[PDB]
RNA sequence: GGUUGCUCGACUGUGAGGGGACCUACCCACUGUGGAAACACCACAGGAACUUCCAACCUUCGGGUGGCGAGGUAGGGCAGAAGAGUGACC
Protein backbone atom coordinates (compact mmCIF):
# COMPACT_ATOMS: atom_id res chain seq x y z
CA UNK A 1 0.00 0.00 0.00
CA UNK A 2 0.87 3.72 -0.27
CA UNK A 3 -0.88 4.96 3.13
CA UNK A 4 1.95 7.28 4.67
CA UNK A 5 1.49 10.26 7.41
CA UNK A 6 4.89 12.29 7.12
CA UNK A 7 5.08 14.69 10.29
CA UNK A 8 7.29 17.48 10.13
CA UNK A 9 7.80 21.11 11.20
CA UNK A 10 8.80 20.09 14.87
CA UNK A 11 12.03 21.12 16.47
CA UNK A 12 13.81 23.08 19.04
CA UNK A 13 11.13 25.86 19.99
CA UNK A 14 11.90 28.99 23.02
CA UNK A 15 9.38 28.37 26.11
CA UNK A 16 6.29 29.97 25.57
CA UNK A 17 6.80 30.06 21.46
CA UNK A 18 4.64 28.82 18.95
CA UNK A 19 4.67 25.85 16.11
CA UNK A 20 2.91 24.17 13.27
CA UNK A 21 3.23 20.71 12.66
CA UNK A 22 1.97 19.44 9.43
CA UNK A 23 1.43 16.18 8.37
CA UNK A 24 1.42 15.03 4.38
CA UNK A 25 -0.65 11.59 3.48
CA UNK A 26 0.06 9.37 1.12
CA UNK A 27 -1.78 6.61 -0.27
CA UNK A 28 -5.21 7.63 1.25
CA UNK A 29 -7.30 11.18 1.26
CA UNK A 30 -7.80 12.26 4.88
CA UNK A 31 -11.45 13.92 3.39
CA UNK A 32 -12.98 10.08 4.53
CA UNK A 33 -10.88 9.30 8.13
CA UNK A 34 -10.60 10.49 11.12
CA UNK A 35 -7.55 12.24 11.80
CA UNK A 36 -5.56 12.23 15.25
CA UNK A 37 -2.40 13.72 16.28
CA UNK A 38 -0.86 11.65 19.15
CA UNK A 39 2.40 12.78 21.72
CA UNK A 40 4.99 10.95 23.46
CA UNK A 41 7.27 12.61 25.86
CA UNK A 42 10.66 11.27 26.33
CA UNK A 43 10.69 7.98 27.76
CA UNK A 44 7.40 8.61 28.55
CA UNK A 45 3.86 6.88 27.03
CA UNK A 46 1.36 7.83 24.20
CA UNK A 47 -0.70 10.66 24.75
CA UNK A 48 -4.09 11.88 23.24
CA UNK A 49 -3.67 15.24 21.66
CA UNK A 50 -6.47 16.23 18.90
CA UNK A 51 -8.68 14.98 16.44
CA UNK A 52 -10.63 16.15 13.81
CA UNK A 53 -13.94 14.40 12.70
CA UNK A 54 -14.44 13.80 8.75
CA UNK A 55 -17.47 15.54 6.92
CA UNK A 56 -17.85 17.99 10.19
CA UNK A 57 -14.36 19.08 11.43
CA UNK A 58 -15.42 18.88 14.38
CA UNK A 59 -12.27 19.29 16.66
CA UNK A 60 -11.52 17.16 20.28
CA UNK A 61 -8.61 17.87 22.03
CA UNK A 62 -6.95 16.51 25.09
CA UNK A 63 -7.63 18.72 27.75
CA UNK A 64 -3.82 19.25 28.84
CA UNK A 65 -3.73 21.62 25.57
CA UNK A 66 -7.40 22.68 25.44
CA UNK A 67 -6.89 26.29 23.93
CA UNK A 68 -3.05 26.59 23.21
CA UNK A 69 -3.45 23.89 20.34
CA UNK A 70 -5.74 23.52 16.84
CA UNK A 71 -6.52 20.81 15.11
CA UNK A 72 -7.32 21.77 11.61
CA UNK A 73 -7.20 20.52 7.84
CA UNK A 74 -7.10 21.62 4.27
CA UNK A 75 -8.59 18.88 2.57
CA UNK A 76 -7.45 19.79 -0.85
CA UNK A 77 -3.33 19.92 0.31
CA UNK A 78 -4.71 16.41 1.90
CA UNK A 79 -2.34 17.63 4.95
CA UNK A 80 -3.14 17.92 8.70
CA UNK A 81 -2.15 20.57 10.62
CA UNK A 82 -1.43 21.45 14.59
CA UNK A 83 -0.53 24.70 16.12
CA UNK A 84 0.53 24.95 19.01
CA UNK A 85 0.58 28.20 20.97
CA UNK A 86 2.41 29.14 24.43
CA UNK A 87 4.65 26.15 24.45
CA UNK A 88 5.90 24.73 28.07
CA UNK A 89 8.67 22.45 28.33
CA UNK A 90 6.59 19.66 29.44
CA UNK A 91 5.27 20.03 25.79
CA UNK A 92 8.75 18.38 24.62
CA UNK A 93 7.73 15.13 22.68
CA UNK A 94 7.79 13.22 19.87
CA UNK A 95 4.62 14.65 17.90
CA UNK A 96 3.21 11.61 15.92
CA UNK A 97 0.23 11.55 12.96
CA UNK A 98 -2.12 8.76 13.09
CA UNK A 99 -5.17 7.85 10.49
CA UNK A 100 -7.71 5.90 12.28
CA UNK A 101 -9.15 3.56 10.21
CA UNK A 102 -12.26 2.36 8.27
CA UNK A 103 -14.96 1.27 10.64
CA UNK A 104 -15.95 -1.49 8.57
CA UNK A 105 -11.70 -2.68 8.68
CA UNK A 106 -10.53 -1.54 11.96
CA UNK A 107 -13.14 -0.07 14.41
CA UNK A 108 -11.51 2.97 15.73
CA UNK A 109 -8.29 1.23 15.58
CA UNK A 110 -5.65 4.09 14.75
CA UNK A 111 -4.52 2.09 11.79
CA UNK A 112 -1.10 4.30 9.99
CA UNK A 113 1.17 6.64 12.10
CA UNK A 114 3.61 8.66 10.72
CA UNK A 115 7.43 8.56 12.23
CA UNK A 116 6.43 11.66 14.38
CA UNK A 117 8.49 15.04 14.17
CA UNK A 118 10.46 15.84 17.32
CA UNK A 119 9.22 19.06 19.32
CA UNK A 120 11.98 20.73 22.07
CA UNK A 121 10.43 22.90 24.14
CA UNK A 122 13.74 24.75 25.71
CA UNK A 123 15.24 28.32 25.94
CA UNK A 124 18.88 26.69 25.85
CA UNK A 125 20.34 27.63 22.37
CA UNK A 126 21.73 24.65 19.81
CA UNK A 127 25.40 23.09 19.43
CA UNK A 128 26.54 20.66 17.44
CA UNK A 129 28.69 17.97 18.51
CA UNK A 130 32.43 17.60 18.91
CA UNK A 131 33.26 13.88 17.55
CA UNK A 132 35.98 12.28 18.69
CA UNK A 133 37.21 8.64 17.75
CA UNK A 134 37.36 5.53 20.04
CA UNK A 135 40.82 3.80 18.98
CA UNK A 136 40.89 0.08 19.06
CA UNK A 137 43.44 -2.27 20.91
CA UNK A 138 39.85 -12.53 17.31
CA UNK A 139 38.12 -9.59 17.66
CA UNK A 140 38.31 -6.25 19.02
CA UNK A 141 36.15 -3.08 19.61
CA UNK A 142 35.85 0.75 17.63
CA UNK A 143 33.62 3.60 17.73
CA UNK A 144 33.27 7.23 17.69
CA UNK A 145 32.36 9.76 20.61
CA UNK A 146 29.70 12.00 19.77
CA UNK A 147 30.33 14.64 22.51
CA UNK A 148 28.67 17.93 24.11
CA UNK A 149 25.29 18.34 21.13
CA UNK A 150 22.07 20.16 21.99
CA UNK A 151 19.45 19.27 21.19
CA UNK A 152 18.58 16.08 20.04
CA UNK A 153 18.71 13.86 17.83
CA UNK A 154 21.62 12.98 15.98
CA UNK A 155 22.24 10.28 13.61
CA UNK A 156 25.86 7.83 13.14
CA UNK A 157 26.56 5.64 10.15
CA UNK A 158 29.48 3.86 9.61
CA UNK A 159 31.02 4.17 6.09
CA UNK A 160 27.92 5.66 5.03
CA UNK A 161 26.17 3.10 5.89
CA UNK A 162 28.14 0.46 4.70
CA UNK A 163 28.79 -1.08 8.12
CA UNK A 164 25.47 -2.51 9.62
CA UNK A 165 26.19 -5.40 11.14
CA UNK A 166 27.85 -5.48 14.97
CA UNK A 167 27.36 -1.67 15.65
CA UNK A 168 25.98 -0.60 18.36
CA UNK A 169 25.06 3.00 19.01
CA UNK A 170 24.14 4.11 22.82
CA UNK A 171 21.32 6.92 23.83
CA UNK A 172 22.48 9.73 24.55
CA UNK A 173 22.52 10.78 28.33
CA UNK A 174 22.15 14.40 29.10
CA UNK A 175 25.38 15.90 30.56
CA UNK A 176 25.25 17.95 33.59
CA UNK A 177 26.16 20.89 30.76
CA UNK A 178 22.90 19.70 29.90
CA UNK A 179 24.60 19.26 26.51
CA UNK A 180 23.97 15.48 25.00
CA UNK A 181 26.95 13.15 24.75
CA UNK A 182 26.81 9.55 22.93
CA UNK A 183 29.14 7.26 21.92
CA UNK A 184 28.66 4.56 19.11
CA UNK A 185 30.83 1.16 18.46
CA UNK A 186 30.92 -1.52 16.04
CA UNK A 187 33.04 -4.59 16.90
CA UNK A 188 35.01 -6.01 13.67
CA UNK A 189 37.86 -9.12 13.77
CA UNK A 190 41.47 -7.31 14.45
CA UNK A 191 42.80 -8.65 11.15
CA UNK A 192 41.10 -5.79 9.05
CA UNK A 193 42.18 -3.20 11.34
CA UNK A 194 45.53 -1.94 8.92
CA UNK A 195 43.38 -2.43 5.55
CA UNK A 196 39.89 -1.60 6.36
CA UNK A 197 38.93 2.30 6.43
CA UNK A 198 36.39 2.69 9.31
CA UNK A 199 35.19 6.26 8.78
CA UNK A 200 31.90 7.27 11.43
CA UNK A 201 29.34 9.84 9.34
CA UNK A 202 27.96 12.07 12.08
CA UNK A 203 24.92 14.31 11.20
CA UNK A 204 22.95 16.66 13.66
CA UNK A 205 20.79 18.26 11.13
CA UNK A 206 18.88 21.21 14.40
CA UNK A 207 22.65 22.86 14.05
CA UNK A 208 22.78 22.00 10.24
CA UNK A 209 26.88 19.59 11.63
CA UNK A 210 27.88 16.94 9.66
CA UNK A 211 31.09 15.29 10.56
CA UNK A 212 32.89 12.25 9.47
CA UNK A 213 35.64 11.17 11.62
CA UNK A 214 37.89 8.64 10.27
CA UNK A 215 38.59 5.63 13.11
CA UNK A 216 41.97 4.46 12.69
CA UNK A 217 43.88 2.32 15.30
CA UNK A 218 46.55 3.20 17.80
CA UNK A 219 49.09 5.66 15.70
CA UNK A 220 52.04 3.88 17.77
CA UNK B 1 -15.19 13.64 33.97
CA UNK B 2 -12.53 11.75 31.83
CA UNK B 3 -12.19 7.63 31.59
CA UNK B 4 -9.31 6.13 33.03
CA UNK B 5 -7.11 3.65 31.21
CA UNK B 6 -5.34 1.85 34.09
CA UNK B 7 -2.93 -0.81 32.69
CA UNK B 8 -0.80 -3.81 34.52
CA UNK B 9 2.16 -4.58 34.66
CA UNK B 10 4.12 -1.55 34.31
CA UNK B 11 6.86 -4.29 32.91
CA UNK B 12 7.30 -7.91 32.09
CA UNK B 13 10.28 -10.31 31.89
CA UNK B 14 9.37 -13.63 30.57
CA UNK B 15 10.75 -16.40 28.57
CA UNK B 16 10.54 -16.74 24.70
CA UNK B 17 7.54 -19.09 24.25
CA UNK B 18 5.49 -18.49 27.54
CA UNK B 19 1.94 -16.91 27.93
CA UNK B 20 2.09 -13.19 28.45
CA UNK B 21 -1.25 -11.17 29.73
CA UNK B 22 -1.63 -7.62 29.99
CA UNK B 23 -4.93 -6.06 31.22
CA UNK B 24 -6.39 -2.11 31.60
CA UNK B 25 -9.50 -1.42 33.40
CA UNK B 26 -11.23 1.41 32.35
CA UNK B 27 -12.40 3.72 34.73
CA UNK B 28 -16.49 3.92 32.78
CA UNK B 29 -17.77 1.32 30.13
CA UNK B 30 -16.07 2.01 27.33
CA UNK B 31 -17.56 -0.40 25.56
CA UNK B 32 -15.52 -2.71 23.19
CA UNK B 33 -14.17 0.65 22.42
CA UNK B 34 -10.41 -0.78 23.23
CA UNK B 35 -7.73 -1.16 20.98
CA UNK B 36 -4.26 -2.93 21.66
CA UNK B 37 -1.09 -1.46 20.29
CA UNK B 38 2.98 -2.88 19.83
CA UNK B 39 5.03 0.38 20.03
CA UNK B 40 8.80 -0.89 19.47
CA UNK B 41 11.67 1.40 20.21
CA UNK B 42 12.04 4.09 18.25
CA UNK B 43 9.44 3.06 15.76
CA UNK B 44 5.72 3.89 15.58
CA UNK B 45 2.94 2.22 17.72
CA UNK B 46 1.24 -0.28 15.36
CA UNK B 47 -1.91 -1.71 15.56
CA UNK B 48 -2.88 -5.13 17.17
CA UNK B 49 -6.46 -5.49 18.26
CA UNK B 50 -9.53 -3.13 17.43
CA UNK B 51 -12.29 -3.08 19.28
CA UNK B 52 -10.83 -4.94 22.07
CA UNK B 53 -11.04 -8.78 20.35
CA UNK B 54 -10.83 -8.21 16.74
CA UNK B 55 -7.50 -8.71 15.30
CA UNK B 56 -6.18 -6.54 12.77
CA UNK B 57 -5.35 -7.20 9.79
CA UNK B 58 -1.97 -8.98 9.30
CA UNK B 59 -1.08 -9.09 13.00
CA UNK B 60 -0.11 -12.91 14.08
CA UNK B 61 -2.92 -15.03 15.40
CA UNK B 62 -0.57 -15.68 18.60
CA UNK B 63 -2.37 -11.87 19.68
CA UNK B 64 -5.58 -11.70 21.17
CA UNK B 65 -8.04 -9.15 22.52
CA UNK B 66 -10.42 -9.56 25.91
CA UNK B 67 -12.97 -8.03 27.41
CA UNK B 68 -15.01 -8.47 30.64
CA UNK B 69 -17.00 -5.71 31.66
CA UNK B 70 -14.64 -2.75 32.00
CA UNK B 71 -11.47 -5.11 31.81
CA UNK B 72 -9.48 -5.60 28.65
CA UNK B 73 -6.47 -7.99 28.71
CA UNK B 74 -4.46 -8.57 25.47
CA UNK B 75 -2.79 -11.72 25.61
CA UNK B 76 0.56 -13.63 23.72
CA UNK B 77 -0.14 -17.16 23.71
CA UNK B 78 3.70 -18.08 23.05
CA UNK B 79 6.12 -14.84 22.95
CA UNK B 80 8.59 -15.16 19.99
CA UNK B 81 12.01 -12.99 20.77
CA UNK B 82 10.52 -10.00 17.99
CA UNK B 83 7.60 -9.29 20.11
CA UNK B 84 10.08 -7.49 22.73
CA UNK B 85 7.96 -4.16 22.82
CA UNK B 86 6.31 -1.79 25.22
CA UNK B 87 2.41 -2.29 24.91
CA UNK B 88 -0.48 0.02 25.23
CA UNK B 89 -4.21 -0.36 25.49
CA UNK B 90 -6.12 2.75 23.78
CA UNK B 91 -10.07 3.55 24.60
CA UNK B 92 -11.84 5.50 22.19
CA UNK B 93 -15.63 5.49 23.36
CA UNK B 94 -15.24 8.93 24.03
CA UNK B 95 -13.27 12.37 23.97
CA UNK B 96 -10.88 13.04 25.03
CA UNK B 97 -8.96 9.85 24.07
CA UNK B 98 -6.80 8.22 26.39
CA UNK B 99 -4.10 5.69 26.60
CA UNK B 100 -2.59 3.38 29.41
CA UNK B 101 0.71 3.93 30.96
CA UNK B 102 2.19 1.07 28.45
CA UNK B 103 3.86 -2.43 29.82
CA UNK B 104 7.37 -3.02 29.05
CA UNK B 105 7.94 -6.75 28.16
CA UNK B 106 11.45 -8.14 27.63
CA UNK B 107 12.60 -11.43 26.41
CA UNK B 108 14.54 -14.11 28.82
CA UNK B 109 17.54 -16.45 27.06
CA UNK B 110 20.57 -17.53 28.98
CA UNK B 111 23.27 -15.90 30.66
CA UNK B 112 25.43 -14.31 28.18
CA UNK B 113 28.84 -12.58 29.91
CA UNK B 114 30.20 -9.44 28.77
CA UNK B 115 32.86 -8.52 26.33
CA UNK B 116 34.76 -6.05 27.77
CA UNK B 117 36.51 -3.51 26.15
CA UNK B 118 38.15 0.15 27.27
CA UNK B 119 39.08 3.15 25.72
CA UNK B 120 41.60 6.25 26.73
CA UNK B 121 40.60 9.39 25.58
CA UNK B 122 41.82 10.57 22.16
CA UNK B 123 44.52 12.72 21.40
CA UNK B 124 42.18 15.20 19.55
CA UNK B 125 40.29 15.66 22.64
CA UNK B 126 42.82 16.55 25.23
CA UNK B 127 43.93 19.07 23.24
CA UNK B 128 40.64 20.67 23.31
CA UNK B 129 40.62 19.98 27.22
CA UNK B 130 38.63 17.36 27.88
CA UNK B 131 39.66 14.03 28.98
CA UNK B 132 36.46 11.04 28.71
CA UNK B 133 37.42 7.13 29.45
CA UNK B 134 34.69 4.72 27.63
CA UNK B 135 34.15 0.99 28.94
CA UNK B 136 32.19 -1.21 27.18
CA UNK B 137 29.94 -4.35 28.29
CA UNK B 138 29.00 -5.94 24.96
CA UNK B 139 26.18 -8.12 24.14
CA UNK B 140 25.13 -9.63 27.20
CA UNK B 141 22.32 -10.73 29.51
CA UNK B 142 20.79 -10.08 32.26
CA UNK B 143 21.53 -6.67 31.97
CA UNK B 144 21.95 -6.08 35.70
CA UNK B 145 25.08 -5.52 35.79
CA UNK B 146 28.00 -3.27 38.05
CA UNK B 147 30.28 -1.38 36.80
CA UNK B 148 33.69 0.33 39.04
CA UNK B 149 36.04 2.93 37.93
CA UNK B 150 38.91 2.72 39.70
CA UNK B 151 42.23 5.12 39.43
CA UNK B 152 45.38 4.23 40.73
CA UNK B 153 43.05 2.07 42.70
CA UNK B 154 41.02 4.62 44.00
CA UNK B 155 36.64 3.52 43.45
CA UNK B 156 35.68 6.68 41.76
CA UNK B 157 32.11 8.19 42.42
CA UNK B 158 29.67 10.16 40.48
CA UNK B 159 31.61 11.25 37.66
CA UNK B 160 30.84 8.05 35.14
CA UNK B 161 27.55 8.04 33.25
CA UNK B 162 26.37 4.84 31.25
CA UNK B 163 23.56 3.89 29.20
CA UNK B 164 22.36 0.60 27.54
CA UNK B 165 20.85 -0.54 24.17
CA UNK B 166 17.35 -2.11 24.08
CA UNK B 167 17.34 -6.12 23.68
CA UNK B 168 18.55 -7.14 20.25
CA UNK B 169 15.39 -8.79 19.49
CA UNK B 170 17.43 -11.47 17.11
CA UNK B 171 20.03 -11.32 20.32
CA UNK B 172 17.77 -10.45 23.14
CA UNK B 173 20.92 -9.65 24.90
CA UNK B 174 22.14 -5.60 25.91
CA UNK B 175 25.00 -3.71 25.75
CA UNK B 176 26.60 -1.19 28.20
CA UNK B 177 28.76 2.20 27.56
CA UNK B 178 30.20 3.46 30.99
CA UNK B 179 31.95 6.64 30.65
CA UNK B 180 34.37 8.40 33.20
CA UNK B 181 34.94 12.01 32.20
CA UNK B 182 37.51 14.46 33.60
CA UNK B 183 39.69 17.72 33.68
CA UNK B 184 42.49 17.18 31.87
CA UNK B 185 44.43 18.18 34.53
CA UNK B 186 42.76 15.74 36.59
CA UNK B 187 43.41 13.17 33.68
CA UNK B 188 47.16 13.98 33.81
CA UNK B 189 47.25 13.24 37.85
CA UNK B 190 46.65 9.83 37.59
CA UNK B 191 48.54 6.57 35.64
CA UNK B 192 46.18 3.71 35.34
CA UNK B 193 42.37 3.95 34.52
CA UNK B 194 40.18 0.91 34.96
CA UNK B 195 37.12 -0.28 34.77
CA UNK B 196 35.63 -3.53 36.98
CA UNK B 197 32.78 -5.56 35.63
CA UNK B 198 30.23 -7.92 37.54
CA UNK B 199 28.37 -9.55 35.99
CA UNK B 200 26.20 -12.80 36.44
CA UNK B 201 27.64 -14.37 33.71
CA UNK B 202 31.52 -13.69 35.29
CA UNK B 203 32.70 -16.07 37.71
CA UNK B 204 35.30 -13.12 38.73
CA UNK B 205 35.08 -9.52 38.04
CA UNK B 206 36.59 -8.66 35.01
CA UNK B 207 38.68 -5.48 34.95
CA UNK B 208 40.08 -3.88 31.49
CA UNK B 209 42.64 -1.09 32.03
CA UNK B 210 45.22 0.94 30.62
CA UNK B 211 47.77 3.39 31.15
CA UNK B 212 48.88 7.03 30.88
CA UNK B 213 50.60 7.44 27.32
CA UNK B 214 51.57 3.94 26.63
CA UNK B 215 51.34 3.02 23.08
C1' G C 1 -96.16 27.59 19.72
C1' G C 2 -94.35 23.05 19.52
C1' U C 3 -92.70 18.19 16.95
C1' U C 4 -89.76 16.53 13.32
C1' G C 5 -87.15 16.35 9.17
C1' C C 6 -83.88 19.26 5.07
C1' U C 7 -80.10 22.99 3.79
C1' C C 8 -76.63 26.74 5.15
C1' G C 9 -73.67 27.65 9.43
C1' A C 10 -70.67 31.28 14.19
C1' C C 11 -68.07 28.31 16.81
C1' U C 12 -66.17 24.26 19.69
C1' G C 13 -64.25 19.02 20.31
C1' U C 14 -61.39 15.20 18.77
C1' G C 15 -61.38 13.46 25.13
C1' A C 16 -55.52 7.93 27.56
C1' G C 17 -56.39 2.15 30.53
C1' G C 18 -63.17 1.67 34.69
C1' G C 19 -60.29 4.83 27.90
C1' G C 20 -57.68 8.88 23.32
C1' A C 21 -55.52 5.52 17.50
C1' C C 22 -59.10 10.71 11.34
C1' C C 23 -55.93 12.95 6.88
C1' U C 24 -52.14 15.73 4.66
C1' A C 25 -47.78 19.26 4.08
C1' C C 26 -43.83 21.63 6.16
C1' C C 27 -41.29 22.30 10.84
C1' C C 28 -39.22 20.17 15.21
C1' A C 29 -37.64 16.10 17.73
C1' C C 30 -36.23 10.47 20.00
C1' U C 31 -34.01 5.13 18.84
C1' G C 32 -31.32 1.94 15.78
C1' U C 33 -28.65 0.36 11.48
C1' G C 34 -26.07 1.98 7.05
C1' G C 35 -23.64 5.93 4.18
C1' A C 36 -15.20 6.16 3.52
C1' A C 37 -19.30 8.67 9.15
C1' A C 38 -17.92 8.31 17.59
C1' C C 39 -20.22 14.66 16.63
C1' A C 40 -22.49 17.01 12.42
C1' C C 41 -25.17 16.07 7.60
C1' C C 42 -27.91 12.13 4.75
C1' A C 43 -30.91 7.55 3.70
C1' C C 44 -33.56 3.92 5.77
C1' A C 45 -36.02 1.26 9.74
C1' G C 46 -38.46 2.08 14.14
C1' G C 47 -41.37 4.86 18.99
C1' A C 48 -42.10 -0.48 25.27
C1' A C 49 -45.83 -4.24 26.22
C1' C C 50 -50.73 -5.49 26.94
C1' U C 51 -54.96 -3.10 25.64
C1' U C 52 -58.15 0.65 23.32
C1' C C 53 -60.17 2.56 18.54
C1' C C 54 -61.88 2.40 13.38
C1' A C 55 -62.19 8.89 12.48
C1' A C 56 -60.32 5.00 7.24
C1' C C 57 -60.85 0.88 3.34
C1' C C 58 -63.21 -4.04 1.92
C1' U C 59 -67.22 -7.13 3.39
C1' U C 60 -70.92 -12.87 1.60
C1' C C 61 -72.19 -8.69 7.77
C1' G C 62 -69.14 -14.08 9.81
C1' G C 63 -65.24 -10.71 9.47
C1' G C 64 -61.10 -8.70 6.96
C1' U C 65 -57.21 -5.05 5.53
C1' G C 66 -54.43 -1.18 6.80
C1' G C 67 -52.85 1.68 10.57
C1' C C 68 -49.37 5.29 17.10
C1' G C 69 -43.48 10.52 17.52
C1' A C 70 -49.35 11.76 23.22
C1' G C 71 -44.09 17.54 19.63
C1' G C 72 -45.35 22.17 16.91
C1' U C 73 -47.74 25.20 12.45
C1' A C 74 -51.40 25.11 8.79
C1' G C 75 -55.20 23.06 5.86
C1' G C 76 -58.66 19.55 5.89
C1' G C 77 -61.90 15.00 7.90
C1' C C 78 -65.29 13.16 11.51
C1' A C 79 -68.33 14.90 15.29
C1' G C 80 -71.03 18.25 17.72
C1' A C 81 -73.41 22.73 17.33
C1' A C 82 -75.18 30.09 18.78
C1' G C 83 -77.52 30.85 14.74
C1' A C 84 -80.41 31.43 10.18
C1' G C 85 -83.43 29.78 6.73
C1' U C 86 -86.94 26.00 4.99
C1' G C 87 -90.32 22.09 4.78
C1' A C 88 -93.83 18.02 6.84
C1' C C 89 -96.89 17.16 10.97
C1' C C 90 -99.66 18.66 15.03
Known amino acids: SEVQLVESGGGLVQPGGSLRLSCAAS????????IHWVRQAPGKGLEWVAS????????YYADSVKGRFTISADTSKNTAYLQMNSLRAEDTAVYYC???????????????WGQGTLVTVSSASTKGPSVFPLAPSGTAALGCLVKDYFPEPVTVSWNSGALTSGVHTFPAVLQSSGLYSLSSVVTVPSSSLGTQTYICNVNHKPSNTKVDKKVEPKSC | SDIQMTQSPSSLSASVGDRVTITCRAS??????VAWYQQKPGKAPKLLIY???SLYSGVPSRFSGSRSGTDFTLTISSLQPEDFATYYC?????????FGQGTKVEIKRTVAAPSVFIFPPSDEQLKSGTASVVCLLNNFYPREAKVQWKVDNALQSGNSQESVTEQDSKDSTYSLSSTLTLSKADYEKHKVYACEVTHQGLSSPVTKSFNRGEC
Open chain 1, 27 to 34: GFYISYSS
Open chain 2, 51 to 53: SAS
Open chain 1, 98 to 112: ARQGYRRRSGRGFDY
Open chain 2, 90 to 98: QQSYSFPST
Open chain 1, 52 to 59: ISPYSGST
Open chain 2, 28 to 33: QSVSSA
